[PDB]
């Protein structure tokens, strides 16, 4: 959520229950080059599948040899 | 049988994306005393959390090898 609503990621957040969870944990699903992140919260869950969509050449990484 | 039906599989579902998935799979979360079942589909995601209440006898799912 922010002061802009255009392109975040394709994530959906569904609110269910109000029962406490052990910890707000995130699960990553990786199937067929598809990532999915699940946020378990005490008021709902966020599930966000990403087919490496945001994976562009940003920043440009280069590992220092050693 | 009729219009009386407040009982349903209490799962929250949203349809997002349209990319084919490797397998419509389910991940079952068990954190604390909370169970959750996540359906990955090629056009949506179903997250069904169960704090151990939706225990009905049907479906009969042999655990698809995660």
Curated annotation (Swiss-Prot), chains A, B:
Where in the cell? Secreted
Disulfide pairings: 11-48
Listed GO CC annotations: extracellular region; extracellular space
In which tissues or organs does this protein occur? Highest level in spleen, lower in peripheral leukocytes and very low levels in lung, colon and small intestine.
Q: Name one GO molecular function term.
A: chemokine activity
Any stretches that span the bilayer, and where are they? none
Keywords tagged on the record = Chemotaxis, Cytokine, Disulfide bond, Secreted, Signal
> Which GO biological process annotations does it have?
antimicrobial humoral immune response mediated by antimicrobial peptide; cell chemotaxis; cell-cell signaling; cellular response to interleukin-4; cellular response to transforming growth factor beta stimulus; chemokine-mediated signaling pathway; inflammatory response; mature natural killer cell chemotaxis
Q: Does the keyword Aminoacyl-tRNA synthetase apply?
A: no
- In which broad location class does this protein mainly occur, judging by the first location in its UniProt entry? secreted
Q: What family does the database annotate?
A: Belongs to the intercrine gamma family.
Protein role? Chemotactic activity for lymphocytes but not for monocytes or neutrophils. In thymus, mediates medullary accumulation of thymic dendritic cells and contributes to regulatoy T cell development, playing a role in self-tolerance establishment.
> Which protein is depicted?
Lymphotactin
What species does this protein belong to?
A: Homo sapiens (Human)
Q: Which gene encodes it?
A: XCL1
Task: Describe which stretch of the whole protein the shown chain covers, with first residue, last residue and complete length.
Answer: 22 to 87 of 114
């Amino acid at each position: 959520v922010g002061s802009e609503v255009s392109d975040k990621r394709t994530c959906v957040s569904l609110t269910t229950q109000r029962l406490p969870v052990s910890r707000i944990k995130t699960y990553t699903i990786t199937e067929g080059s598809l990532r999915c992140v699940i946020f378990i919260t005490k008021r709902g869950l966020k599930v966000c599948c990403d087919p490496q969509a945001t994976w562009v050449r940003d920043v440009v990484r280069s590992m220092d040899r050693k």
